[PDB]
């Protein structure tokens, strides 16, 4: 069993690392509005959207019972962005960096729990 406070205290810095990255995290900070961007095929391809603000909300309200659940959600966010965008799109490169930074911070923390 984990309590909501310990999970937030343990994992929030890894999420903060992602938020720290400017301008990489900016498009990930809130959920996409595909009609606004003119990419109306987005929810055809990305079946389960995920963004930093949803992950932060779940960690703040303790909707994660287990730390794997917070880790699924981060990878869901990256896998969505890699699924939808071309390898040469600016969002692709951004997702690639945040993914890069997330590995450096997550591994030590998961061993700690």
Ligand X SMILES: CCS(=O)(=O)Nc1cc(-c2cn(C)c3c(=O)[nH]ccc23)cc2c1ccn2C(C)(c1ccccn1)c1ccccn1
Tell whether residue 36 is a contact of ligand X (CB under 6 A).
Answer: yes
The tokens describing 5, both together, are: 């406070």
The tokens describing 61, both together, are: 């309200």
| Three-class DSSP labels, 54-67 | HHHHHHHHCCCCCH
Contact mark string toward ligand X, 2..31, x via CB under 6 A: ------------------------xxx-x-
What is the number of helices (H) and of strands (E) in the chain? 6, 0
Stretch that binds ligand X, among 4-12, 60-68, 84-92, 104-112 (CB under 6 A): 84-92
Q: How far is CA 87 from the centre of its chain?
A: 18
| Least distance from ligand X to the Cβ atom of residue 30, Å | 5
| Least distance from ligand X to the Cβ atom of residue 80, Å | 7
Q: Which residues bind ligand X (CB under 6 A)?
A: 26-28, 30, 32-33, 36-37, 39, 81, 84-85, 90-91
């Amino acid at each position: 069993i984990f309590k909501p406070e310990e999970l937030r205290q343990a994992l929030m810095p890894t999420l903060e690392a992602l938020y720290r990255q400017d301008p990489e995290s900016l498009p990930f900070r809130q959920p996409v509005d595909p009609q606004l961007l003119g990419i109306p095929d987005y929810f055809d391809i990305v079946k389960n959207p995920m963004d930093l603000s949803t992950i932060k909300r779940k960690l703040d309200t303790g909707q994660y019972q287990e730390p794997w659940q917070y880790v699924d959600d981060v990878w869901l966010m990256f896998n969505n962005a890699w699924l939808y965008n071309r390898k040469t799109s600016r969002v692709y490169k951004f997702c690639s960096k945040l993914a890069e930074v997330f590995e450096q911070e997550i591994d030590p923390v998961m061993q700690s729990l």
